[PDB]
Assembly symmetry: C3
Homo-oligomer: 182 residues x 3
């Protein structure tokens, strides 16, 4: 045992290794593995590096969700919106939503459309300038997308609550992407 | 001792476990934990997997910093700006900064307001189109935020160095988010 | 036997080999073990799967040389910085500005974006950006479109606008765009 308490050449085998929960590195060395009792559950440490906290901080999910948008078009348009969430950071990448407009209206989803874990929580809405199209025209003013904390998505023709206009040629948007922390 | 040097059914307990810094996996096995002396400080290894390097390649931090902005308002507005940094990639998510304007001015921070590790270094400034408001109006032209390498943040009413304008209604911006590499 | 129950030993070893097992041998949140439900096995601390968390995120970063041309007398060549995390891409562009000797959009050749950064889910992805033309700072946004064939196009405005012959500089200050492929 005494030989294990100081440096040796032993390649130790064990079915498992249980590290006492302690508030500080017991040896002070950068190559000592220890278990940090300042957290519950405890954190695995390697020297001063907190492995458990680093692992928790690099959480990532990605995929898509179905989104139904409606307003100016004769019928709702349904497409899958791609997403990535890393820690608290979200990206949404939208495919095209475009069709002829039979009425004048903003584009919006139902309340709750954004998956719960992608909804803004620090802010009531988050706003982004995006390129939109109306009746086949490419307007020079930016459109505006607002993501709401209740999960509703609203897309305006311009920053001043602008509506898309009845007409043919395509109203809506080419693919775009927005990134934000919840 | 000899029983520890080959496979056993021991659930070993230790107050800590110090791994000799060595240049190669001493057993070659994918279930061997070791400490890699090819780096200083050393790297935690599991088999051929470099845990320290993998965590360092992500290098994620997140949180917020207090930001004081001033210009058109009677007094500075102070709010926390949320951030994520992943390797060289930064996200900033701003809460609302808006109040009545008693003078005509751009909005800016002090020099050094952006935390040092979020400041552009590859570029002298990085620019983003954002939706801004002035006197309660929602102008169709985008506002512009410029992040400067000296840590100053400037927000303009439009792309042409535009100033926010004296008046009641609210001047500044709804929440927005911008993403960039330093 | 003293090692098989709690002790105050700071143990040293040249390495530590953990038996591959399908479940935590002690049940405790401070036990390190090797999880045989995966190949290669996963390093565990309690119920925390260290190997899985690291394998779930894949980050690359660097830069690529980009040649843009159109309104300028000759192409401009600069490095564009990128990060890719799983399917998520950031591009951060340095300034591309010079005087314009013709009226034209700015574009790259086909295939200019590295293959692993090209949109595949969409044919193009569009972004509003601040551009400059003949030294003027126009209030209308410019537009960058990233195409699935790897071409990059930058327009003076959203309506296929071209940069304009003249002095003062045409192109853009640095900007950044982020998107999933």
């Amino acid at each position: 045992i005494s030989s294990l308490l100081e440096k040796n050449i032993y390649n130790v085998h064990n079915k498992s290794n249980t590290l006492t929960n302690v508030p500080a590195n017991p040896t002070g060395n950068t190559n000592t593995v220890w278990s940090n009792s300042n957290f519950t559950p405890p954190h695995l440490m390697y020297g001063a590096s907190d492995i458990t906290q680093a692992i928790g901080n690099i959480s990532l999910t990605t995929g898509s969700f179905s989104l139904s948008l409606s307003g100016p078009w004769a019928s709702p348009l349904v497409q899958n919106v791609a997403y990535t969430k890393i820690n608290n950071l979200v990206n949404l990448t939208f495919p095209p939503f475009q069709a002829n407009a039979t009425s004048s209206a903003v584009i919006n989803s139902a309340i709750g459309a954004l998956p719960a874990d992608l909804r803004p929580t620090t802010n009531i809405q988050v706003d982004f300038e995006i390129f939109v199209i109306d009746d086949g025209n490419r307007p020079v003013n930016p459109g505006l997308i607002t993501l709401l904390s209740n999960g509703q998505i609203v897309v305006y023709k311009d920053n001043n609550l602008g509506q898309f206009t009845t007409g043919i040629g395509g109203s809506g948007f080419n693919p775009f992407s927005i990134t934000y922390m919840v």
